[PDB]
Amino acid sequence: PQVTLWQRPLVTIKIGGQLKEALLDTGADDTVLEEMSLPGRWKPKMIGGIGGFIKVRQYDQILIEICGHKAIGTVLVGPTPFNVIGRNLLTQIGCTLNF
Amino acid sequence: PQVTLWQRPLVTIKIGGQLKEALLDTGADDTVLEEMSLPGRWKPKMIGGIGGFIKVRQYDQILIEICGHKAIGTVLVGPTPFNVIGRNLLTQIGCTLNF
Numbered sequence A, B: 001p002q003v004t005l006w007q008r009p010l011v012t013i014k015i016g017g018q019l020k021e022a023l024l025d026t027g028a029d030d031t032v033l034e035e036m037s038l039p040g041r042w043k044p045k046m047i048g049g050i051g052g053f054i055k056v057r058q059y060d061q062i063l064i065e066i067c068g069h070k071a072i073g074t075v076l077v078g079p080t081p082f083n084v085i086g087r088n089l090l091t092q093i094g095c096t097l098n099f
């Protein structure tokens, strides 16, 4: 799709059998999701944002379908205000920025 | 131009006679820059990000050049780690997201 930026660029994702919506976020290196039951192993990590750092759990090799596109990668789950999809998954669905 | 997201999408901007680099950030509503000196009047605002909230100063009607394109808008100056251009300016240079 081509999405213009007059509104939040929100998309539907299915992760773990749950459907959420999320923001396509070009400035975020990593994908961070709000608290959610994911099965499996995870490693604690911290990321920074504006505002500070947050401790998060990192899940590797998780399948996500973002607007119907499947991709697999790392997601971080933690106290974000909003589900953000960052460049690690954006490259996989082929997402580009044009001006 | 077209920008793929394998690297952080930085552009050069010129603002208040100064050159900086900034990140193009579709997940950000507002543009927020590191502290620098801008002329004029401002007012306090408080912005939330991942990690928390920060207080910033709002300058309205600032001229920025982002790549070779000019825009005039609100700019927030404050304690970010990284200069972020948000959708309020991104819309003015006609930036789209495509997948």
Ligand SMILES: O=C(Nc1nccs1)c1cccc(CN2C(=O)N(Cc3cccc(C(=O)Nc4nccs4)c3)[C@H](Cc3ccccc3)[C@H](O)[C@@H](O)[C@H]2Cc2ccccc2)c1
Residues within 6 Å of the ligand: A025, A026, A027, A028, A029, A030, A031, A032, A046, A047, A048, A049, A050, A051, A080, A081, A082, A084, A086, B025, B026, B027, B028, B029, B030, B031, B032, B046, B047, B048, B049, B050, B051, B081, B082, B084, B086
């Ligand atoms: O990978 C990451 N970090 C890592 N650390 C180590 C390794 S990887 C990472 C992953 C996701 C997000 C971020 C951190 N992050 C944010 O904090 N903001 C808040 C933001 C930025 C700019 C403006 C606003 C804004 O307008 N906010 C408003 N609040 C009220 C009104 S408007 C908000 C949003 C996301 C957001 C929007 C709304 C609510 C909550 C969050 C941006 O869209 C993101 O790209 C990014 C920008 C950034 C990148 C690096 C360092 C600092 C800041 C970093």
